[PDB]
């Protein structure tokens, strides 16, 4: 690795200061989000799915991809000439990727020369590579690349193409099968040094330390989640997190707010959640007994 | 608690009112101040946290939350070695007069939906043990 | 980990689906481990209590020893929200209340009156 593997083509044709967030940290714009988020629906507002899960090519809009439901475009080669910032690829963890020729591996050109591209070939990670990538382009717009979103289906017209773990609309739509890009749950995304530049509206995304296990590999993740004290958090509001959690004290797992893992409590085999502490799960159920097989005398 | 005696100032200078939180050690004794201008009702000035970082009201940082008219204009602090609470002005105005009451604050635990890391936090409470009230006069 | 279909919005539950049910007509529900049977007796939705990781009854009293006769349902929201597990409490149950053995099994076998009336 060398810094000349990072494309740096930054052109201020508009919105002067956008570039500030590349060089400086904590120089994000953070303005106009109330309007941009106007079209970002909750998972609960989508049609219920059913039937087997299929896949589709996420040929989405050219508006800024700042919403979890945005279907990412299928990946292919991206020219370095259009890239300002570093390119981050997401496996459960962020990965920095650099420039390449179509055939040669390094291109230590800073992305200034032609034929200098980002390969970006991906197939869901249990096999290799990544779920999807995010980067800032040369004029200040965030663009994404990723695995085909899941075609969930449903009875109505407002069906969902799911790039994330859409448990409440379809029970099998796990991150490991539907994930594309950094969104883990509709309200949580994988953190990285440029998250507030690429997704500048993710201000107040309280950070959590979580651990996710895919295939045979553990990833220690920084999770950024949307949570407001007092926000409703009933069972109907809880998403599946697919975590292999870190321990808090001796009795609780750290989970994303209003989410749960599928791992059972040690003593009961059941899932035990707290009503008021939003981001915890118990690893120990309270009820216990004596094994009956031990006394099945003839 | 017991408050210090009467004080008179000219505009400017500085003024300090102290409270002796006697009868108990500062295990978990919160204190704050309430102002009453002559002929007026009560104004919350602010409170201070005698404890650690776990209990800073809800935001979870400042040990000293103040009412809206006291946002940096007056300082509230506690000397933990002398069990003494203070209210201080670094510029006394002619309007800063009347009775300043010092009272023990009684926080109420956080409720509703919240995160693990803030589970020990408290919301704003009420005032239980009141001191006698001290008189401040500011004039030319 | 079971999922209730509810109102069209799916959610996590510990309530046993019928596909997990094995049973005895003598008030006992046997089931795939990992859930607790809910019985709406008539209308009341009353949750049965585990005796073993796979068996529950109406009151936890260890009762003495084909169409299904139980009216189970994915209702109750069983043990989803227990009270807080205290670090001390967990240790206490693991050291004191919890208990597998063999010497006990033998002591029990040697004391059977052999009044095997069942």
């Amino acid at each position, epitope marked *: 690795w060398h810094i000349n593997r990072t494309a740096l083509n930054c052109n201020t044709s508009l919105e002067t200061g956008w570039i500030a967030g590349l060089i400086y940290l904590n120089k994000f714009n953070s303005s106009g989000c109330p309007e941009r988020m106007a079209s970002c629906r909750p998972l609960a507002d989508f049609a219920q799915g059913w039937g087997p899960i299929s896949y589709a090519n996420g040929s989405g809009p050219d508006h800024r991809p700042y919403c979890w439901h945005y279907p990412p475009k299928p990946c292919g080669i991206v020219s370095a000439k259009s890239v300002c910032g570093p390119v981050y690829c997401f496996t459960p963890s962020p990965v920095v990727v650099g420039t390449t020729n179509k055939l040669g591996a390094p291109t230590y050109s800073w992305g200034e020369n032609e034929t200098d591209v980002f390969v970006l070939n991906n197939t869901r990670p249990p096999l290799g590579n990544w779920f999807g990538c995010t980067w800032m382009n040369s004029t200040g717009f965030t663009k994404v690349c990723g695995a085909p979103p899941c075609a969930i289906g449903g009875v109505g017209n407002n069906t969902l193409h799911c790039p994330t773990d859409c448990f409440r609309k379809h029970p099998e739509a796990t991150y490991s099968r539907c994930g594309s890009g950094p969104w883990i749950t509709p309200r949580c995304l994988v953190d990285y040094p440029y998250r507030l530049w690429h997704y500048p509206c993710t201000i107040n995304y309280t950070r959590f330390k979580v651990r996710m296990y895919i295939g045979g590999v553990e990833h220690r993740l920084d999770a950024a989640c949307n949570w407001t004290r007092g926000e409703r958090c009933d069972l109907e509001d809880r998403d599946r997190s697919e975590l292999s959690p870190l321990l808090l*004290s001796t009795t609780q797992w750290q989970v994303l707010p209003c989410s749960f893992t599928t791992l059972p409590a040690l003593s009961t085999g059941l899932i035990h959640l707290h009503q008021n502490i939003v981001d915890v799960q118990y690893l120990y159920g309270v009820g216990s007994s004596i094994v009956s097989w031990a006394i099945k005398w003839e | 608690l017991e408050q210090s005696g009467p004080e008179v100032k000219k505009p400017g200078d500085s003024l300090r009112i102290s409270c002796k939180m006697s009868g*108990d050690s500062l*295990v*978990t004794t919160w204190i704050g101040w309430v102002r009453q201008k002559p002929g007026q009702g009560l104004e919350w000035m602010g409170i201070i946290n005698p404890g650690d970082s776990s209990t800073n009201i809800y935001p979870g940082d400042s040990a000293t939350r103040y009412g809206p008219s006291f946002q940096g204009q007056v300082t509230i602090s506690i000397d933990k070695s002398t069990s003494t609470a203070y209210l201080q002005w670094n510029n006394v105005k002619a309007s800063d007069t009347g009775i300043y009451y010092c009272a023990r604050h009684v926080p109420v635990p956080i409720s509703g939906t919240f995160l693990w890391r803030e589970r020990e936090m408290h919301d704003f409470g009420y005032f239980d043990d009141w001191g006698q009230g001290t008189l401040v006069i500011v004039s030319s | 980990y079971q999922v209730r279909n509810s109102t069209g919005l799916y959610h996590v539950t510990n309530d046993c689906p019928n596909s997990s049910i094995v049973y005895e007509t003598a008030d006992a529900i046997l089931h795939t481990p990992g859930c607790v049977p809910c019985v709406r007796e008539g209308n009341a939705s009353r949750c049965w209590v585990p005796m073993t990781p796979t068996v529950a009854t109406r009151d936890g009293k260890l009762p003495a020893t084909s169409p299904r006769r139980h009216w189970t349902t994915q209702d109750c929201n069983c043990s989803i929200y227990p009270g807080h597990v*205290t*670090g001390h*409490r967990m240790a206490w149950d693991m*050291m*004191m209340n919890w208990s597998p053995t063999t010497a006990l099994v033998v002591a029990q076998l040697l004391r059977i009156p052999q009044a095997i009336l069942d």
Partner: antibody
Amino acid sequence: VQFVQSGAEVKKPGASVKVSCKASGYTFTRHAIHWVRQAPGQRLEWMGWINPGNGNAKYSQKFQGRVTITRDTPASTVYMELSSLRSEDMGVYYCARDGGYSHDYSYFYGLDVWGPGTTVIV
Amino acid sequence: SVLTQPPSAASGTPGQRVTISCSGSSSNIGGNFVDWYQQFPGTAPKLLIYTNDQRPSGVPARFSGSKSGTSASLAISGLRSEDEADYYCAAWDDIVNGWVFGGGTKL
């Protein structure tokens, strides 16, 4: 509900000691028996505990390589052995009753019944 | 960690109330519960607080109180000379999986 210790011991450094508590006035099937040490003028110190009947026992890491405890169930007696004395072990050793966990699982029952305390001199 | 309580009580005359404080971390004194015990020289200690819903039989109302967070205390209302015992703060420690006692406060 009395716990009865027997004797006291004086041993030179490096020597082992043994104390036991017989107990009566209760069933000794529904509570734990704890061991607590107190050097003269010092803090009560936790050593470990045993589950009557099961024989299950846990130890403080401080004594994990130094002590062991057992129970002679029909004798209603808990025994504790210290493999050797190291001067710092001088003091009074007590056994105590860890009551149920309030039964209704409210505030727990702490150690309400303590034996007299045996004296161990290094 | 280790529970911390003062080495001595404020003391005073009969009719006076004193408070014996105790503090620690969230790994022991916080959460769980904090037992309080009374010990006179020459004997075994006995319970005062956080047992039997904080009021054990045989113990007068004289000995009472509790605190939130990682604090605890024992208030002794009326310093009868018969109460000049050492008092101990005890709690379950979730790091070491055992009991922790404080230094002992002398009244």
